[PDB]
Design a protein around this ligand. Structure first.
Ligand SMILES: Nc1nc2c(ncn2[C@@H]2O[C@H](COP(=O)(O)OP(=O)(O)O)[C@@H](O)[C@H]2O)c(=O)[nH]1
Length: 161
């Protein structure tokens, strides 16, 4: 059976864990690794997911997970300008470790339910256009865009293969 190794990257506190918990466990309340079999477009596959900001203890496991990772969610929060500014560093880091220019990625703007916004949707759309990747607005709290973000990434991985 097909397995997809997914890595969710972004600054501390953007909601990487929250998004992954919503996907896998279907809840939100206000584990760094998750594993579940799902059906996407009629195809069964196991999602093996790591959430990481890059500053975690097991660095060796991280570079490993980066080399093996087939697709990446690049996550920022719409109320965290720095987290948006950090996206380029994460994308550049992935490219370098994968030693590749065609790595499946999706840009995710999380916390879309919050009324504090400091990152414009246009800013993110423009960035994603430059990178040639999808941009999806999400809320781990309301579930907005959560399946869409991860399933879009799986579809990007299929295109690549
Ligand atoms: N309102 C709201 N809060 C969120 C959302 N996603 C995460 N949070 C909260 O943001 C904080 C950080 O979330 P967390 O998943 O630990 O971030 P991580 O460090 O990126 O894994 C927690 O208090 C979460 O409950 C969201 O979409 N909306």
């Amino acid at each position: 059976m097909t397995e997809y190794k997914l890595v969710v990257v972004g600054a501390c506190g953007v909601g990487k864990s929250a998004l992954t918990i919503q996907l896998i466990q279907n809840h939100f309340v206000d584990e760094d690794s998750y594993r579940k079999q799902v059906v996407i477009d009629g195809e069964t596959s196991l999602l093996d997911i790591l959430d990481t900001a890059g500053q975690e203890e097991y660095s060796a496991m991280r570079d490993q997970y980066m080399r093996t990772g087939e697709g990446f969610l690049l996550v920022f929060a719409i109320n965290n300008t720095k987290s948006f500014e950090d996206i380029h560093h994460y994308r550049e880091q992935i490219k370098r470790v994968k030693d590749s220019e065609d790595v499946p990625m999706v840009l995710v703007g999380n916390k879309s339910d919050l009324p504090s916004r400091t990152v414009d949707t246009k800013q993110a759309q423009d960035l994603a256009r430059s990178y040639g990747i999808p941009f999806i607005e999400t809320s781990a709290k309301t579930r907005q865009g959560v399946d869409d973000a991860f399933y879009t990434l799986v579809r990007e991985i299929r295109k690549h293969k």
